[PDB]
Amino acid sequence: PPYTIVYFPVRGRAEAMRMLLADQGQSWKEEVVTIDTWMQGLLKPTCLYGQLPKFEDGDLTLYQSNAILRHLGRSLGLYGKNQREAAQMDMVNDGVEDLRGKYVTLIYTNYENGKNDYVKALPGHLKPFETLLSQNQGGKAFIVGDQISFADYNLLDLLLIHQVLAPGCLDNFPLLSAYVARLSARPKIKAFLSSPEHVNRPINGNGKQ
Amino acid sequence: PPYTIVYFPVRGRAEAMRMLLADQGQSWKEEVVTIDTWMQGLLKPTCLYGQLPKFEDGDLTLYQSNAILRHLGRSLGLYGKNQREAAQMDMVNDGVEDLRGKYVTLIYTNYENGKNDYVKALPGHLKPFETLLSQNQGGKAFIVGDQISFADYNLLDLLLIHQVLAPGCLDNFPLLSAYVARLSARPKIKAFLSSPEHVNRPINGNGKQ
Ligand SMILES: N[C@@H](CCC(=O)N[C@@H](CSCc1ccc([N+](=O)[O-])cc1)C(=O)NCC(=O)O)C(=O)O
Ligand SMILES: N[C@@H](CCC(=O)N[C@@H](CSCc1ccc([N+](=O)[O-])cc1)C(=O)NCC(=O)O)C(=O)O
């Protein structure tokens, strides 16, 4: 710390790290970049991969949303208790990111013509996570183990935006449903989900959700 | 241990971990799954995400190539000397994974009509790595720190296949060129890169490269 988040005025790839920080009682500076400013072409070229979010831990400057989540999980005790749990949380996060990539393409490239096909293919993309919970204390604890990890925050965030995109996508996934309701109930999480910062912030940058 | 790689008869997303295991003097078993066997649909459903590669490390089974690479780095000491380097390495690997994703898209879904555009845009995608090396000991060591890490193996593999796709794409990147030659010169990698198993394995599933 101190933490600073440089990103567009949307939840997108910054919301999971925001929940994580919040749930851990951490504070951070918010450096919002409007599309207008972005198109000026002054910030983009100074970005490692020419993209946001950009993360600053004071001395360390980072890019790549998942790399940032992993850094936070590792430097905050949210990365499992051993090497086996760490490997599994990664396997989980990788799956979360694959689905997120598809979500983004849909939202920004073919919402109208693709949504119908997306929602229909969604169940087969959620099952792997339902299966992971069943194999872990009947799905009573977390995605991996019994302690909140950076992978949970990413998964939770991914499931929440999908419930918005398709209201009943978790109806056939008991474990995931309760899992979502539970984590959301967590004091600082529930509070984060109701804060104006979050509430007023659009999920995506094109007004689609 | 022991180590077992379950994947199609190609290098693709398994060559980097193989090269990694090779440079560490480690041996492993290969369970080659053919296209005809995969089409039977017996194995696919047993995969967490319905895809390969599948990795077995003793009683630990893993899916997702980058999760597998991270597991090996952590367990074999190829994940930096501290948190700062670990975060930096994930930032690199994620970058490598974004370009790999685009590479696969070109190869499998738009090779003939998109290659020109891809190669023309490639310099912009390689610049970040050149930059990363110049900021680390002037670029005489590795991608992050003074010790080889899982990120190097993934980047090295990606760079090698891009030289096959676009001969001389590293001509305008002195650090990245010398980097490849340097790492490819490592005795164990030098041997792997010329080993029959590696050589006899096509780069991708459709023969295009
Ligand atoms: N792998 C990278 C992917 C980053 C990425 O896609 N970044 C987008 C923003 S998230 C998606 C997004 C797009 C637009 C808005 N907006 O408000 O206009 C918000 C979010 C970006 O920087 N785009 C700028 C560019 O490439 O030039 C990661 O995980 O961090
Ligand atoms: N994010 C996952 C992506 C995995 C992936 O794309 N897997 C492909 C194989 S690598 C790309 C590939 C495709 C085809 C061949 N082939 O020989 O026919 C080889 C490699 C797959 O399992 N496809 C089967 C399916 O989805 O049903 C990861 O990083 O591991």
Curated annotation (Swiss-Prot), chains A, B:
Keyword Repeat: no
EC numbers for this chain: 2.5.1.18
Binding site for glutathione: Y7, R13, W38, K44, Q51, L52, Q64, S65
Pfam families in alphabetical order: GST_C_3 (PF14497), GST_N (PF02798)
Major localisation: cytoplasm
Alphabetically ordered keywords of this record: Acetylation, Cytoplasm, Lipid metabolism, Mitochondrion, Nucleus, Phosphoprotein, Transferase
UniProt enzyme class: transferase
Tissue: Ubiquitously expressed.
Keyword Plastid among UniProt keywords: no
PANTHER family in alphabetical order: GLUTATHIONE S-TRANSFERASE (PTHR11571), GLUTATHIONE S-TRANSFERASE P (PTHR11571:SF255)
Entry protein name: Glutathione S-transferase P 1
Source organism (scientific name): Mus musculus
